[PDB]
Amino acid sequence: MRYPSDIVDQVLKAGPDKGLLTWEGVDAACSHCSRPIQNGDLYSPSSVGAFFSDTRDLASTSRSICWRCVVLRKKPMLYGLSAAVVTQDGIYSISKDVNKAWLFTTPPPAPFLVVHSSSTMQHLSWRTPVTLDNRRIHVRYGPNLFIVRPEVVRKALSIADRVNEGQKKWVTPVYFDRKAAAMGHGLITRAGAEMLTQEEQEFFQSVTPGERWALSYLMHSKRPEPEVGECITEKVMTSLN
């Protein structure tokens, strides 16, 4: 519940691969997940391929992967956590917009860990911190480390439901990009320029990029009700074995 690699044996039960070396000597942190490798725990020397391009998100330059993050670099872990929230009892999916509606509005009370892929297969699990508090959520989205406050998401959603109550067409006040890629991601629309007051506009610039990315999955004409995502920890474990 402290390091992102803890879910290897806390969220989902797993063990070392038994071809891993035993650490002898002084303390050194794992290159992935920033977990200190003590004396006696199993570790692997660093054998990343040339296709690994996340050297900028490595926690340390010790060139040693802890066994939990050896499990975390496995391909079934890589496509199993392409969109997943890992609570203290299981791994659930956030692929649907109703699942992100559940995650960023009334979050689960566990100290979870949120990963989401901005591409096909990405190293997501180890390079994000564990969110200890529901109010402050660390979301990994591709090369982006995002922080989402569900209270600010609730305030923006209440603002949007106020300015779009009674109207026939649900027009968004501020445009949000799902990929977080367009220039106008966070830019105020003309309808939102005419239908929001000044302090609401400064609020919509003042939100964090993670809240913008979350609102991108929950600001559209059909509004997703918070529905808990389907539990996928059985699918990941079966794939892992």
Partner DNA sequence: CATCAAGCCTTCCTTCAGGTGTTGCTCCAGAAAGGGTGT
Which residues bind to DNA, rule: CB under 7 A? 48-49, 51-54, 73-75, 78-79, 118-123, 142
Rounded least distance, CB 16 to DNA, Å: 14
Q: Is the dihedral of CA 209, 7, 52, 42 positive or negative?
A: positive
Q: Which residues contact 197 (CB under 8 A, 6 or more apart)?
A: none
Tokens of 68: 């939990």
Q: Which of 11, 30, 156, 159 binds Zn ion (CB under 5 A)?
A: 30
Q: Residue 103 Cβ, how far from Zn ion at the closest point, in Å?
A: 24
Residue 33's binding partner among Zn ion, DNA, none (Cβ under 5 to 8 angstroms by kind) is: Zn ion
Letter for the amino acid at 227? E
Q: Which does 119 bind (CB under 5 to 8 A by kind): DNA, Zn ion, none?
A: DNA
Q: What are phi and psi of 65, to 5 degrees?
A: -105, 125
Task: Give least dist CB 194 to Zn ion, A.
Answer: 51
Nearer to Zn ion (CB atom), residue 33 or residue 42? 33
69 binds, among DNA, Zn ion, none (CB under 5 to 8 A by kind): Zn ion
With CB cut-offs between 5 and 8 Å by kind, which of Zn ion, DNA, none does residue 66 bind? Zn ion
Contact partners, residue 87, CB within 8 Å, separation at least 6: 11, 108, 110, 111, 112
**How does DSSP classify residue 231?**
B
Q: How far is Cα 9 from Cα 19, in angstroms, rounded to an integer?
A: 18
Does residue 35 interact with Zn ion by CB under 5 A?
yes
